[PDB]
Amino acid sequence: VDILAAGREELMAALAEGDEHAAVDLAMRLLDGGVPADVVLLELVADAQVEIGVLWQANRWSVAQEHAATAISERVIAAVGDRAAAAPTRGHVVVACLDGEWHALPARIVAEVLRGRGWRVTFLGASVPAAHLVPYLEEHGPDAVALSCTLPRGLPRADQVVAACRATGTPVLVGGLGFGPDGRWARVLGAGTWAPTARAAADLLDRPEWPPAPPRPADPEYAALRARRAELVDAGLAALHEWFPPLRDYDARRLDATLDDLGDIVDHLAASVYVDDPELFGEFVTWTAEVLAARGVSPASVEVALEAIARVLDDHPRTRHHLDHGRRALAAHLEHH
Ligand code: B12
Numbered sequence: 001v002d003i004l005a006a007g008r009e010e011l012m013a014a015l016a017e018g019d020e021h022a023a024v025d026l027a028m029r030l031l032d033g034g035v036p037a038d039v040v041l042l043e044l045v046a047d048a049q050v051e052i053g054v055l056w057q058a059n060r061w062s063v064a065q066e067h068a069a070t071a072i073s074e075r076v077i078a079a080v081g082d083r084a085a086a087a088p089t090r091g092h093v094v095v096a097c098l099d100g101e102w103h104a105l106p107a108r109i110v111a112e113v114l115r116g117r118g119w120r121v122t123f124l125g126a127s128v129p130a131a132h133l134v135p136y137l138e139e140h141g142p143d144a145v146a147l148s149c150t151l152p153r154g155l156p157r158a159d160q161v162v163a164a165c166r167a168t169g170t171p172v173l174v175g176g177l178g179f180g181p182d183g184r185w186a187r188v189l190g191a192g193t194w195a196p197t198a199r200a201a202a203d204l205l206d207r208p209e210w211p212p213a214p215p216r217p218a219d220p221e222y223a224a225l226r227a228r229r230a231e232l233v234d235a236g237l238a239a240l241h242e243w244f245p246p247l248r249d250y251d252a253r254r255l256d257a258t259l260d261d262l263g264d265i266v267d268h269l270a271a272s273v274y275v276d277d278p279e280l281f282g283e284f285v286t287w288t289a290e291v292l293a294a295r296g297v298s299p300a301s302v303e304v305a306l307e308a309i310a311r312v313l314d315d316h317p318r319t320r321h322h323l324d325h326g327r328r329a330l331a332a333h334l335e336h337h
């Protein structure tokens with residue numbers, strides 16, 4: 001009687017169909033049967049969300065489905081979290097998404113698991129500016145701040161926000177997909193203490209030791225990518241005009257989508273360079289190829305843009321390595337698909 005495997009399928013069906021009654025009731029029945037709340041949130045809800053991500057990437061997930069499924073998940077997490085909340089005896093943890101980060105569900109799961117272990121949690125929500133977060137810490141003096149980052153493109157900003165929080169004397173936890181496999185990009189930056197899940201985060205806070213770091217060498221190549229972003233986007237676009245025939249026939253909507261995506265390409269290259277890990281840019285490029293291909297856009301367009309960006313930045317040595325690796329990963333992806 002693998003109740004978890006059965007539950008996983010039932011929840012996914014409810015989310016995909018927008019059935020809020022079935023989803024919330026399933027969560028309540030699991031708790032009725034003594035299934036731990038952190039199991040419901042991590043092995044069921046989080047897992048269903050991963051699969052939704054896969055459907056979305058493959059262009060099999062509508063706007064209407066996003067709203068319905070996210071709203072239901074908010075309700076599930078709220079009901080489970082409140083039900084399993086323990087007496088707030090241990091202290092106070094502030095939880096926040098980075099500025100420009102709208103993936104609040106992972107952070108809310110962290111918040112609820114912590115409540116379930118006796119922490120008072122203030123959840124400051126999605127996209128919290130440091131200008132708001134830092135004063136909050138200085139006057140409330142929580143035992144810890146937990147910063148969530150899901151998008152690797154947010155890593156440079158993460159590094160800044162972490163440092164600003166540390167300057168308050170507040171111990172910093174970090175997590176989310178944005179810090180990469182095994183938190184490798186958290187470790188590169190020496191950013192707070194990373195943990196893979198809410199359960200692991202709570203376990204960290206049970207350690208008796210309870211887990212101003214100078215090393216931050218100037219990165220001029222990173223700064224050049226920020227400063228020259230529009231130039232690089234334009235070079236991308238010009239190369240696509242020349243060498244990517246379908247672009248000539250694009251309406252305004254499609255030119256705008258192209259410009260947005262070119263901007264993201266530059267931003268992910270910047271993040272890659274910032275943490276000195278071309279694998280960031282590599283995995284981003286091959287992911288982009290799948291995203292575009294599933295929407296009828298030839299991923300050969302990406303090679304045209306990357307090659308053009310590479311010409312402009314050919315005298316930027318680290319950056320041209322990142323670009324080489326991206327284009328190489330793309331080529332291998334397109335041969336091997
Ligand atoms: C739902 C969703 C959205 C929702 C989020 C709504 C909300 N309230 O959260 C909305 C619709 C807003 C959205 C928008 C976008 N998203 Co989205 N989406 C997702 C999705 C499907 C699930 C998110 C989720 O619930 N995760 C919950 C579970 C799965 O997360 P988890 O990692 O197990 O959580 C644990 C750890 O992260 C850890 N943790 C997290 N934070 C912290 C903090 C601390 C301190 C600690 C210790 C631990 C910790 O603990 C958690 C709990 O155990 C994911 C797919 C995915 N794989 O995550 C994408 C995904 C993250 N989204 C993606 C994208 C691209 C987007 C958009 C850019 C798309 C667009 N619109 O152009 C935007 C960007 C918004 C932004 N600026 O942030 C991509 C990103 C890939 C990339 N980096 O390039 C993903 C991976 C989907 C995909 N397969 O392509 N998204």
Ligand SMILES: C=CC1=C(C)/C(=C/c2[nH]c(/C=C3N=C(/C=C4\NC(=O)C(C)=C4C=C)C(C)=C\3CCC(=O)O)c(CCC(=O)O)c2C)NC1=O
Binds near residue numbers: 255265297305
């Ligand atoms: C280099 C050449 C290049 C071209 C020519 C390009 C074109 C391009 N991308 C599109 C959509 C898209 N492109 C993306 C890609 C992303 N969304 C994200 O959040 C992130 C980070 C990415 C990846 C970079 C998505 C998600 C869509 C569909 C979503 C939408 O715009 O509604 C579309 C519209 C598809 C359609 O509806 O007809 C076009 C024409 N993108 C390129 O990168």
